[PDB]
Design an enzyme around this catalytic site. Structure first.
Site, PDB file in Angstrom:
ATOM      1  N   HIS D 111       0.819  -1.206   0.000  1.00 35.25           N
ATOM      2  CA  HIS D 111       0.000   0.000   0.000  1.00 35.25           C
ATOM      3  C   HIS D 111       0.857   1.262   0.000  1.00 35.25           C
ATOM      4  O   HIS D 111       0.339   2.352   0.263  1.00 35.25           O
ATOM      5  CB  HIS D 111      -0.951   0.009   1.200  1.00 35.25           C
ATOM      6  CG  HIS D 111      -1.666  -1.291   1.409  1.00 35.25           C
ATOM      7  ND1 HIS D 111      -1.228  -2.247   2.298  1.00 35.25           N
ATOM      8  CD2 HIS D 111      -2.780  -1.798   0.831  1.00 35.25           C
ATOM      9  CE1 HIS D 111      -2.044  -3.284   2.263  1.00 35.25           C
ATOM     10  NE2 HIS D 111      -2.994  -3.038   1.381  1.00 35.25           N
TER      11      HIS D 111
HETATM   12  C1  HEC Z   1      -6.527 -11.464  -8.470  1.00 33.74           C
HETATM   13  C2  HEC Z   1      -6.747 -12.381  -7.488  1.00 33.74           C
HETATM   14  C3  HEC Z   1      -8.034 -12.104  -6.624  1.00 33.74           C
HETATM   15  C4  HEC Z   1      -9.292 -12.333  -6.994  1.00 33.74           C
HETATM   16  C5  HEC Z   1      -9.833 -12.893  -8.318  1.00 33.74           C
HETATM   17  C6  HEC Z   1     -10.122 -11.939  -5.869  1.00 33.74           C
HETATM   18  N1  HEC Z   1      -9.324 -11.480  -4.843  1.00 33.74           N
HETATM   19 FE1  HEC Z   1      -9.924 -10.825  -3.054  1.00 33.74          FE
HETATM   20  N2  HEC Z   1      -8.045 -10.319  -2.578  1.00 33.74           N
HETATM   21  C7  HEC Z   1      -6.922 -10.561  -3.347  1.00 33.74           C
HETATM   22  C8  HEC Z   1      -5.777 -10.033  -2.645  1.00 33.74           C
HETATM   23  C9  HEC Z   1      -4.342 -10.124  -3.212  1.00 33.74           C
HETATM   24  C10 HEC Z   1      -6.202  -9.502  -1.509  1.00 33.74           C
HETATM   25  C11 HEC Z   1      -5.436  -8.792  -0.392  1.00 33.74           C
HETATM   26  C12 HEC Z   1      -5.745  -7.314  -0.244  1.00 33.74           C
HETATM   27  C13 HEC Z   1      -4.882  -6.598   0.741  1.00 33.74           C
HETATM   28  O1  HEC Z   1      -4.620  -7.165   1.830  1.00 33.74           O
HETATM   29  O2  HEC Z   1      -4.501  -5.463   0.355  1.00 33.74           O
HETATM   30  C14 HEC Z   1      -7.639  -9.667  -1.449  1.00 33.74           C
HETATM   31  C15 HEC Z   1      -8.444  -9.249  -0.419  1.00 33.74           C
HETATM   32  C16 HEC Z   1      -9.768  -9.609  -0.272  1.00 33.74           C
HETATM   33  C17 HEC Z   1     -10.580  -9.377   0.897  1.00 33.74           C
HETATM   34  C18 HEC Z   1     -10.043  -8.690   2.164  1.00 33.74           C
HETATM   35  C19 HEC Z   1     -10.541  -7.257   2.400  1.00 33.74           C
HETATM   36  C20 HEC Z   1     -10.108  -6.759   3.753  1.00 33.74           C
HETATM   37  O3  HEC Z   1     -10.861  -5.911   4.285  1.00 33.74           O
HETATM   38  O4  HEC Z   1      -9.038  -7.252   4.192  1.00 33.74           O
HETATM   39  C21 HEC Z   1     -11.795  -9.865   0.646  1.00 33.74           C
HETATM   40  C22 HEC Z   1     -13.043  -9.880   1.553  1.00 33.74           C
HETATM   41  C23 HEC Z   1     -11.774 -10.412  -0.683  1.00 33.74           C
HETATM   42  N3  HEC Z   1     -10.518 -10.247  -1.233  1.00 33.74           N
HETATM   43  C24 HEC Z   1     -12.835 -11.007  -1.312  1.00 33.74           C
HETATM   44  C25 HEC Z   1     -12.860 -11.398  -2.627  1.00 33.74           C
HETATM   45  C26 HEC Z   1     -14.016 -11.868  -3.324  1.00 33.74           C
HETATM   46  C27 HEC Z   1     -15.401 -12.004  -2.662  1.00 33.74           C
HETATM   47  C28 HEC Z   1     -13.636 -12.142  -4.577  1.00 33.74           C
HETATM   48  C29 HEC Z   1     -14.568 -12.691  -5.703  1.00 33.74           C
HETATM   49  C30 HEC Z   1     -15.433 -11.684  -6.143  1.00 33.74           C
HETATM   50  C31 HEC Z   1     -12.241 -11.854  -4.704  1.00 33.74           C
HETATM   51  N4  HEC Z   1     -11.786 -11.394  -3.495  1.00 33.74           N
HETATM   52  C32 HEC Z   1     -11.497 -12.021  -5.857  1.00 33.74           C
HETATM   53  C33 HEC Z   1      -6.920 -11.209  -4.563  1.00 33.74           C
HETATM   54  C34 HEC Z   1      -8.017 -11.581  -5.301  1.00 33.74           C
HETATM   55  S1  FES Z   2       2.052  -0.303   3.103  1.00 35.72           S
HETATM   56 FE1  FES Z   2       0.315  -1.572   3.608  1.00 35.72          FE
HETATM   57  S2  FES Z   2       1.199  -3.540   4.106  1.00 35.72           S
HETATM   58 FE2  FES Z   2       2.857  -2.105   4.055  1.00 35.72          FE
END
Ligand code: HEC
Ligand code: FES
Ligand SMILES: CCCCCCCCCCCCCCCCCC(=O)OC[C@H](COP(=O)([O-])OCC(O)COP(=O)([O-])OC[C@@H](COC(=O)CCCCCCCCCCCCCCCCC)OC(=O)CCCCCCCCCCCCCCCCC)OC(=O)CCCCCCCCCCCCCCCCC
Ligand SMILES: CCCCCCCCCCCCCCCCCC(=O)OC[C@H](COP(=O)([O-])OCC(O)COP(=O)([O-])OC[C@@H](COC(=O)CCCCCCCCCCCCCCCCC)OC(=O)CCCCCCCCCCCCCCCCC)OC(=O)CCCCCCCCCCCCCCCCC
Ligand SMILES: CCCCCCCCCCCCCCCCCC(=O)OC[C@H](COP(=O)([O-])OCC(O)COP(=O)([O-])OC[C@@H](COC(=O)CCCCCCCCCCCCCCCCC)OC(=O)CCCCCCCCCCCCCCCCC)OC(=O)CCCCCCCCCCCCCCCCC
Ligand SMILES: CCCCCCCCCCCCCCCCCC(=O)OC[C@H](COP(=O)([O-])OCC[N+](C)(C)C)OC(=O)CCCCCCCCCCCCCCCCC
Ligand SMILES: CCCCCCCCCCCCCCCCCC(=O)OC[C@H](COP(=O)([O-])OCC[N+](C)(C)C)OC(=O)CCCCCCCCCCCCCCCCC
Ligand code: HEM
Ligand code: HEM
Ligand code: HEM
Ligand code: HEM
Lengths: 241, 85, 50, 146, 64, 364, 70, 364
Positions: D111
């Site tokens: 981030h």
């Molecule tokens: C491209 C791969 C990918 C797909 C496809 C994907 N995600 Fe994610 N998702 C991630 C990643 C990587 C993170 C971590 C975000 C972070 O921690 O910044 C994440 C984070 C999240 C979170 C955490 C939010 C939080 O508040 O921590 C949720 C809930 C989530 N995804 C739900 C979903 C759902 C529901 C779908 C289907 C619609 C989906 N994701 C599709 C990769 C994916």
């Molecule tokens: S800047 Fe968000 S995990 Fe480090």
């Protein structure tokens, strides 16, 4: 602080009502076709799907994948088609691998996600239908960072996962972004709480039985108190001038 | 019960009682509704008056705390809206 | 009032507010016994089921 | 009674295995100046940098108010030429990558957090600075982290 | 599609129920220009919290 | 001899429905004991299996393991609610005159706080781990032997599997000592009897048999409070909790806000309102010790009556405690609430429970 | 009121535990365990019937058959 | 009032050193409680990592975890030795007259047998697994519920980690109930006093203050017993155990001989000497129930004196029990010893503890 998710009327947040199971079926479809390779369900097994799916459909779905088997007679490793009792397939071998495929971010396990976030179901909905907004001034976004006002800090590492007409639903309902978000939220609510309907039903039964007991015991207490609530006293006077 | 502190106290303090007549009715001859509405009304009125009495200091202090809370909350809102954090 | 001769309620009051209405056809309170035991039954039933 | 109390208490003391991973010694000669090296200690990754004079001057020029978590080089990093940091972003969990930051220093790309050569957070959502292990400067050819 | 209706509802709600918040976030956008280390994350979060109170439920009622 | 059973113990007629709170607390102690024994039969304490064995084995392999877990959680919360009502009633009716009963009750309260904390530590989630870390950081502020002490408490420099195992043993052990203390509580009470709405000295003709009238009243009030309790078990199962405890513990990440359970918040406030860590520890110890009645011992002390001013001040104490809890949670983001937090804490620390007859005397 | 009926009812059922215990067992079963419990169960199943798991499974089998014919 | 302490309780002068067996039993109960609490703070109950954490983590990573474990094992063995001597003494001096003390003692004996069994189960070794299997197979013979009950007890068709967790919780819980029953044991004894070498009705001028004379005698005897006990902890640490329990359990492989601990062998003998399983279970239950003194209840009964014939028969009982244990374990290879095993069991089952005055009467 970040945006507070709006409070929406969910069908399972209603009087005398439980999970839709049609939204749950459609959310299972979206899970299979969208976020199966990225996120994991460590607590859900194929036999758990025998709640809105038929036995043979679950059997075929389980056999559609491969699972580790006991080593060969020579100790060599093996693979084996899945069964009812096997946990669904993990998307990544180890956290490092995951972090490498998501540009340093680690997609969490979604087994209890609605229970793990403030205002669970709403939040998830608000998270998925919140991706296209304009970026605020003074915010630097990398090539693998996106602006979602509901994520903690406002910057998220998950690319917008939902697009219109991405999935062809079996029952014919159109798969717009809000529709798919609603369906996945219902499916994840089921994953977090697969006991919703039984919990509500037991609640009703227990409250009714305790109410019967309370009425009867209250009457009996009032009856037994009658002996004392009507007691009378008299003091024989002294001899005073 | 005879070897209890409250029995010892009643024996030390009270005299040997005399001239007391008690009348008790069996509950089968007493109506559970007999004195219900009158007691409901009397007890409700008593508790209303008593809580109006003893609740006043708490009400006053809660009003002062509410004033302070409003002041601080809007001060912090102003601080956050102007990037002064 | 500093030399008491009575409790809280006078006999008249109790005769008007606590004693049941007489039933000359039932001089043995069978009605009251039956009602009380029947109204106890639900408590036992709920406790047993629970 | 004295020895028995001591013995029952010693049943709750750290296990020998945990005392084998408590401290590590890392050779430092092989690292030239201007290089950041990542090692593994207690599972936690550790960044060792042979900090030069330019970084020292720049970080000494940094005031004590512009920092979200107010620290100074001598306050947190006694070793003038060596910087030892715990390579984990304080905000959520990510590994800050080497360089690529707006301060020619550690950058978390999850981030976008920026940590200077002092390990102090400057921009982004990180509420604190990178954890500094209680490292000790051993002889000029090694460093005792622990 | 429901996405177009969603965007329309968001615009309506923003300009009819969060107009003061819109004006405030426009004011704060000007302030941070030039200043170093300042962002409008908080103001935009407030704006999108206000907007979704009215826009989000309506869209949620248009889908099965 | 049923008659001999009726007359084995007699009480006053002024036992209003507010005097069943002890029975409600007993009900919830029974619920916690049974639910905890069932949970422990399916529990493994380690950093690799604890969180998983609760959410993947207990709540998904059994028929109603989820129900058992929700019972345990909400029963703890309601036990604390009922105990606070019990204490408030005891202060309202000047029940400090029951010296044995009061001292045993305070011991039980401290024990129950310890039990709740150690139990919350067993779910190896984010909040559990970081609450342990914060409390132990409080521990290491002891002069001289703090750091070594901390190691002995943790068995290492971090929370680990041995830490969870010793916490599990403590959590199992303590509730049974709590049961023994409840038995002593009741023994002392039956020795000195109950106050009632007003204090009178009654001869046997003014008292009534305890059995079965008060047992039936206890059943009635217990059924009502169980209705209220089960409304939370089945429809608000997670209202008395923080969602971050459903995230498995991550020693590398700290939550945005570390907040304890609602029933420990006042203590947490006493730590946030005192800048010096050592002073905060000392003040917490003095607070707990001052709730008791262990001094004076050989000086003549007796207890007088209570009045309307004292009852109004008691209500004020309740208000101040609630405000302090909320503000100590709110101060993390907004720094202007320190004024009201400190004001409420100072007001709490200056509340008179016992009216010192020594307030009035003459000098030599 | 109901003096004769009261006497009859008391003498028949309530006077003896040999009959009061069977009476309360009958009340437990036929009026609590298969009257409140089962009744609430049936009511819950009836209200939420368009979204039922059974309904979902049936529609699913139907649609699968329909798709297999293409 | 130190004097009031001396005179709080007085006993007879005829307390030979044989009347410290209760004190020694209490010593070993304390040792077991402490060492078990220390072990349980490092224990994980699961078939995957139970045998490993006892032998690899507790013993080899702690400073003296090995010493803790050896203390626990040999403390169980010596607790049973002392309890057997305690029972033998109480039978020798006709202490069945202390009715309440005797009944509480028998309940405590049954509890301690259960504690020992459930504890031995926790070391998931070959002997533990197959002893569990044999016992639970004996459970399977109950009419109309043997398989339903067995499944409920095991949590499945096979011993697994859930079974280990149940056993761990029960092993933890039971010793605390045992402590409560020990308290009741001593309470009753103080109510009715001790017998001594001979029974006399003594006035206060013939009795001595219990404290500190008998406390010092208890310290002396306990010191000697602890010397004897430590000669086994440090030099014969596995004399009472079986080497097959140092092998991780294979459910697929059965040991050559399945022998329980030496303090359960008599019970095992009853199982081996009765070909019919249901009859064996009935005889076991009747044996345990006939050790008590719960019948007659309302018929008038009183206890007379004891004599040389009864003491000689008591020696015979001891001999028969020991021989029965040895033979019960020998019969797995030598079939001809069945005769002597059955003979010893028959001699045991027909031993008169209470000489009933109802042996002599007339007919209508
Ligand atoms: C491209 C791969 C990918 C797909 C496809 C994907 N995600 Fe994610 N998702 C991630 C990643 C990587 C993170 C971590 C975000 C972070 O921690 O910044 C994440 C984070 C999240 C979170 C955490 C939010 C939080 O508040 O921590 C949720 C809930 C989530 N995804 C739900 C979903 C759902 C529901 C779908 C289907 C619609 C989906 N994701 C599709 C990769 C994916
Ligand atoms: S800047 Fe968000 S995990 Fe480090
Ligand atoms: C609004 C009314 C609130 C209740 C109220 O006013 O109670 C006191 C008021 C009379 O006060 P009182 O006679 O001075 O006795 C006060 C004593 O404290 C109680 O005297 P008692 O020994 O007769 O008590 C009987 C008992 C048993 O209850 C009853 O008697 C109920 C009424 C009769 C049985 C039929 C209805 C059963 C419903 C039960 C609840 C279901 C849920 O009732 C109570 O305990 C009173 C309510 C307790 C709950 C509220 C307070 C909790 C405080 C907790 C700590 C804070 O009413 C009652 O006590 C109820 C009986 C009289 C009314 C007529 C009942 C029959 C006809 C209507 C049906
Ligand atoms: C979760 C549970 C919540 C609490 C529910 C229970 C409850 O509210 O109890 C209070 C509630 C108060 O009693 P009640 O409603 O006024 O009268 C019910 C019976 O008439 C009470 O009848 P009872 O007190 O006569 O007890 C019947 C029977 C005890 O019951 C039996 O013996 C039945 C089993 C006989 C065969 C096996 C032996 O008593 C005896 O065996 C002793 C009588 C002879 C004494 C020596 C001369 O029930 C009891 O206290 C039951 C008796 C408790 C044991 C002491 C007697
Ligand atoms: C009209 C007809 C009404 C119905 C008839 C009726 O009341 O019949 C009486 C009949 C029974 O009367 P009783 O025979 O005298 O027995 C009642 C009690 O046993 C004995 O009652 P008591 O007279 O002895 O009084 C209870 C006493 C002894 O304490 C207790 O009984 C225990 C409860 C004390 C209060 C709650 C303490 C809670 C502490 C822990 C809290 C933990 C929170 C955790 C939250 C976690 C969240 C995450 O505590 C108090 O009186 C203090 C509480 C005062 C409340 C009112 C305050 C008003 C001023 C507010 C100022 C502004 C504040 C800020 C905004 O039924 C009732 O009393 C039902 C309740 C009626 C309440 C309303 C009464 C009218 C107003
Ligand atoms: C009403 C009292 C306040 C609590 C509100 C929730 C509630 O009553 O839940 C209990 C539940 C009702 O909750 P529910 O299960 O219908 O779901 C909550 C519904 N909303 C969010 C709309 C309130 O059961 C009952 O009230 C039914 C009576 C039980 C006995 C028959
Ligand atoms: C009239 C009463 C007046 C008041 C006094 C009584 C108050 C109520 C009881 C207080 C608590 C007593 C706890 C006793 C249990 C042992 C405590 C212990 O060692 O904890 C380890 C704990 C482990 O730490 P911990 O992790 O449990 O501490 C909690 C820490 N956090 C913050 C993470 C939650 O302490 C230690 O290990 C320190 C060294 C202990 C040395 C002594 C070991 C004794 C071993 C034998 C115990 C036998 C118990 C069974 C017999 C008695 C009961 C029947
Ligand atoms: C001997 C009795 C008890 C045993 C064996 C026991 C055992 C356990 C176990 C194994 C857990 C972890 C499983 C889980 O978290 O769901 C637990 C959790 C807990 N226990 Fe207990 N417990 C007992 C009594 C109590 C008591 C008296 C309280 C206090 C009211 C209590 C409060 C808690 C709390 C607060 C938790 C964590 C709640 C949560 O999971 O979020 N326990 N207990
Ligand atoms: C597990 C928690 C507790 C339980 C189960 C418990 C149980 C009981 C019971 C059954 C009674 C008698 C019934 C009654 O009067 O309500 C009682 C009375 C009492 N308790 Fe507790 N109690 C607990 C905690 C406390 C605490 C923390 C205190 C505070 C010191 C306390 C002080 C008292 C007092 C003073 C009385 C007598 C009040 C009077 O009659 O005047 N109790 N308790
Ligand atoms: C609350 C007190 C107790 C606790 C917490 C406890 C706990 C444990 C634990 C965790 C084990 C397994 C570790 C090991 O096998 O070395 C164990 C084993 C055992 N315990 Fe205990 N125990 C307690 C009291 C007792 C008592 C009173 C006895 C009675 C003699 C007993 C007899 C045994 C036996 C025989 C074993 C297995 C011996 C062996 O390791 O070979 N325990 N206990
Ligand atoms: C946990 C195991 C036990 C402990 C700690 C224990 C403890 C004691 C103690 C301290 C005494 C009084 C001092 C003495 O006379 O030695 C005693 C007496 C006695 N015990 Fe036990 N005991 C245990 C088991 C048993 C058992 C299994 C029985 C068999 C019924 C029993 C029967 C008796 C009798 C009859 C006496 C009184 C003997 C007499 O004075 O004539 N005890 N016990």
């Amino acid at each position: 602080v970040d945006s507070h998710p709006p409070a929406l009327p969910w069908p399972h947040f209603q009087w005398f009502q439980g999970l839709d199971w049609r939204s749950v079926r459609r959310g299972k479809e979206v899970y299979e076709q969208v976020f199966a390779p990225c996120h994991s369900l460590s607590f859900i097994k194929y036999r758990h799907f025998e709640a809105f799916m038929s036995k043979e459909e679950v059997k075929n779905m389980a056999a559609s994948f491969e699972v580790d088997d006991d080593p060969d007679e020579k100790g060599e490793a093996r693979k084996r088609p899945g069964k009812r009792f096997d946990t669904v397939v993990q998307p990544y071998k180890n956290e490092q691998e995951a972090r490498y495929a998501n540009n340093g971010a680690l997609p969490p396990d979604l087994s209890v996600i609605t229970n793990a976030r403030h205002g669970g179901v709403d939040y998830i909905y608000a998270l998925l239908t919140g991706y296209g907004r304009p970026v605020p001034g003074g915010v630097q976004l990398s090539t693998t960072q996106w602006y979602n006002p509901y994520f903690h800090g406002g910057i998220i590492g998950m690319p917008p996962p939902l697009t219109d007409d991405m999935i062809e639903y079996e029952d014919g309902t159109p798969a717009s972004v809000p529709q798919m978000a609603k369906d996945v939220t219902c499916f994840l609510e089921w994953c977090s709480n697969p006991w919703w309907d039984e919990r509500k039903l037991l609640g009703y039964k227990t409250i009714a039985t305790l109410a019967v007991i309370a009425v009867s015991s209250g009457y009996y207490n009032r009856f037994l108190s009658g002996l004392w609530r009507s007691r009378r006293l008299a003091f024989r006077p002294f001899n005073y001038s | 019960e005879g070897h209890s502190a409250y029995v010892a106290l009643e024996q030390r303090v009270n005299t040997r009682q005399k001239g007391i007549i008690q009348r008790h009715l069996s509950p089968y001859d007493v109506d559970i509704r007999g004195n219900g509405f009158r007691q409901i009304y009397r007890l409700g009125m008593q508790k209303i008056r008593y809580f109006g009495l003893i609740g006043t200091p708490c009400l006053l202090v809660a009003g002062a705390y509410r004033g302070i809370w409003v002041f601080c909350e809007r001060l912090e809102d102003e601080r956050y809206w102007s990037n002064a954090l | 009032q500093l030399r008491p001769s009575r409790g809280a309620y006078s006999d008249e009051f109790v005769r008007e507010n606590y004693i049941k209405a007489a039933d000359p056809e039932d001089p043995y309170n069978y009605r009251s016994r039956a009602f009380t035991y029947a109204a106890k039954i639900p408590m036992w039933a709920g406790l047993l089921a629970g | 009674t004295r020895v028995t109390v001591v013995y029952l208490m010693s049943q709750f003391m750290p296990s020998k295995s945990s005392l084998a991973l408590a401290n590590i010694e890392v050779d430092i000669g092989d690292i030239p100046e201007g290089k950041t090296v990542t090692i593994m200690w207690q599972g936690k990754p550790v960044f060792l940098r042979k900090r030069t004079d330019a970084e020292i001057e720049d970080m000494r020029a940094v005031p004590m108010d512009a920092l979200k978590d107010p620290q100074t080089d001598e306050e947190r990093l006694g070793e003038g030429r060596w910087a030892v940091f715990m390579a984990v972003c304080t905000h959520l969990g990510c590994v800050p990558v080497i360089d690529q930051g707006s301060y020619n220093a550690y950058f978390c790309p999850c981030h976008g957090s920026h940590y200077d050569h002092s390990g102090r957070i400057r921009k982004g959502p990180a509420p604190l600075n990178l954890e500094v292990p209680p490292f000790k400067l051993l002889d000029d050819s090694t460093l005792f982290i622990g | 599609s429901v996405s177009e209706l969603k965007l329309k509802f968001e615009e309506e709600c923003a300009h009819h129920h969060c107009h003061d918040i819109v004006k405030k976030v426009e004011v704060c956008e000007e302030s941070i220009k030039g200043k170093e280390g300042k962002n409008c994350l908080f103001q935009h979060a407030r704006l999108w919290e206000c907007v979704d109170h009215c826009a989000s439920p309506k869209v949620f009622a248009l889908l099965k | 001899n049923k008659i001999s059973l009726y007359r084995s113990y007699s009480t006053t007629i002024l036992l209003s429905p507010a005097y069943s709170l002890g029975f409600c607390a007993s009900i919830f102690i029974v619920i916690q004991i049974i639910s905890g024994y069932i949970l422990a039969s399916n529990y493994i304490a380690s950093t690799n299996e604890s969180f998983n064995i609760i959410h993947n084995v207990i709540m998904r392999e059994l028929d109603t393991g989820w129900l058992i877990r929700f019972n345990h959680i909400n029963g703890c919360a309601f036990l604390f609610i009922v105990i606070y009502m019990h204490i408030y009633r005891s202060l309202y009716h000047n029940s400090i005159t029951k010296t044995s009963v009061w001292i045993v009750g305070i011991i039980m309260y401290i024990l129950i706080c310890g039990i709740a904390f150690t139990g919350y530590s067993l779910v190896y989630g984010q909040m559990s781990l970081w609450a342990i870390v914060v409390i132990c950081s409080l521990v290491t502020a002891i002069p001289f032997i703090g750091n070594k002490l901390l190691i002995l408490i943790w068995g290492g420099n971090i929370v680990s599997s041995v830490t969870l195992q010793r916490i599990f043993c403590i959590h199992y052990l303590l509730p049974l000592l709590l049961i023994l203390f409840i038995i002593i509580h009741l023994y002392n009470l039956h020795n000195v009897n109950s106050t009632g709405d007003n204090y009178f000295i009654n001869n046997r003709y003014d008292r009534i048999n305890f059995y079965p009238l008060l047992l039936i009243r206890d059943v009635f009030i217990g059924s009502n409070i169980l209705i209220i309790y089960n409304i939370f078990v089945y429809y608000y199962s997670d209202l008395f909790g923080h969602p971050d405890n459903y995230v498995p513990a991550n020693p590398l990440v700290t939550p945005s806000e570390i907040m304890p359970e609602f029933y420990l918040l006042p203590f947490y406030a006493l730590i946030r309102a005192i800048p010096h860590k050592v002073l905060g520890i000392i003040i917490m110890v003095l607070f707990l010790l001052s709730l008791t009645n262990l001094y004076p011992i050989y000086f003549i002390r007796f207890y007088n009556n209570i009045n309307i001013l004292q009852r109004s001040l008691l209500l004020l104490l309740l208000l101040d405690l609630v405000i302090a809890s909320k503000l100590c949670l709110l101060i993390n983001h907004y720094e202007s609430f320190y004024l009201l937090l400190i004001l409420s804490i100072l007001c709490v620390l200056s509340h008179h429970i016992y009216n010192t007859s020594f307030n009035f005397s003459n000098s030599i | 009121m109901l003096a004769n009926f009261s006497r009859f009812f008391y003498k028949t059922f309530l006077q003896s535990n040999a009959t009061l215990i069977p009476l309360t067992l009958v009340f437990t079963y036929x009026x609590x365990x298969x009257x409140x419990x089962x009744x609430x169960x049936x009511x819950x199943x009836x209200x939420x019937x368009x979204x039922x798991x059974x309904x979902x499974x049936x529609x699913x089998x139907x649609x699968x058959x329909x798709x297999x014919x293409x």
